[PDB]
């Protein structure tokens, strides 16, 4: 039974900068080696066959080098739409067919910042007994950023939760979405709501609020 | 696509079930087939290989023959039937195949479909509009969305105009609340011009519930 070792596991890079994937065969496989490309939210597609040569509809920068052993991935002046996870495949062992662990590579962009949005629970949703109020945070960069909630200057813990996109495939940019859950009547109990973002990418913590 | 996978959303533990993958636009009777799968958090795993007359079959040690494969080349479907589940076998499978006469490597992979195992029963999604507020005038850019809420097992489909809208639309992650049910919003970044004049509709689908809506989202008066 082969072993597919792959460190590190996860990596980060500049755009327009290269980078090279370490791919490690247990059994010394004679050149015969396959390197997979996994973007977010898709299936993994093949780049590199008998670890040297590239795919028909493949872009010349993915490069395949080493041999036995040790393998190696190269991407050169990889674009936003390189974002993805990389494993390794290997088929000198045709009864087991083993992967690697994968590498995650992570790009770095220029800053950029949030644009950000409010939205009031529908009225919906009154009738279900429970109101969510949801923070939008569109297109920035890094992914480090401060959300709060406050209603009637209260900053608002244990009751909101924080979700982060995949870095994006055309801007390399992150999105977030505070929401905030509360009960109906708590929601009524309150007038105005409002939800302060800080970033790097602003010269000041920019809120945003409604009255209701 | 070219190999859709139609198979069980959620099961029972001890259980069967039994997933197809269907061939669309290439031959599928030269290439050999195989199951593979990969559990959340970027693990990739191969469970079995089937070979173009079924005359090679080959299973995962971790399998031991519990699964069985078979394919049919008159109606171009994969089958992966599965006799004894555990929770560890919670995956999503992919319809993968292979390369003629070059390589016993892989080249092309379905969409995958995720089967989730579980004691617990399903659960049908809550839909409501996360409608735009009026601002940025006429020059600036406003968001529209919809939130997902209490829905169990994963994945849902979400989708804006029947996929007429494909651009500036994030689907943020699924987050887990207190209550053990999964939560989702989804939204999108529209010109203020087109708001009033032109409509979006979000479609959500979750398969295991049977749960199909299309919902139309308009700013709020």
Known sequence: DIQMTQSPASLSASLGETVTIECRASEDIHSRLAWYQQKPGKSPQLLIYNANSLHTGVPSRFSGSGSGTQFSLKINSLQSEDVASYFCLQYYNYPPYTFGAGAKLELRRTVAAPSVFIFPPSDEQLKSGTASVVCLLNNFYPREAKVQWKVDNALQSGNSQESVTEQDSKDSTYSLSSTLTLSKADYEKHKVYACEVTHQGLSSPVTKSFNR | ?221
Request: charged fraction near 15%; proline fraction near 5%; charge should be positive.
């Open chain 2, 1 to 221: 696509v070219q190999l859709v996978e139609s198979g069980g959303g959620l099961v029972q533990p001890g259980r069967s079930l039994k997933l197809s993958c269907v061939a669309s636009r290439f031959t599928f009777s030269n290439y050999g087939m195989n199951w593979i799968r990969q559990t959340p958090g970027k693990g990739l795993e191969w469970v079995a290989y089937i070979g173009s007359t079924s005359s090679h079959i080959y299973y995962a040690e971790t399998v031991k023959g519990r699964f069985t494969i078979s394919r049919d080349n008159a109606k171009n479907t994969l089958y992966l039937q599965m006799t004894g589940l555990r929770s560890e076998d919670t995956a999503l499978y992919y319809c993968v195949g292979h390369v003629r006469k070059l390589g016993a490597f892989f080249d092309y992979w379905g969409q995958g479909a995720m089967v989730t195992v579980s004691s617990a029963s399903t659960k049908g999604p809550s839909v409501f509009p996360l409608a735009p507020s009026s601002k940025s005038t006429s020059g600036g850019t406003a968001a529209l969305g919809c939130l997902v809420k209490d829905y169990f097992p994963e994945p849902v489909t979400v989708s804006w105009n029947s996929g007429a809208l494909t651009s500036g639309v994030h689907t943020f992650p699924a987050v887990l609340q207190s209550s053990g049910l999964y939560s989702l919003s989804s939204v999108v970044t529209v010109p203020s011009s087109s708001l009033g004049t032109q409509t979006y509709i979000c479609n959500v689908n979750h398969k295991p519930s049977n749960t199909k809506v299309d919902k139309k989202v308009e700013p709020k008066s």
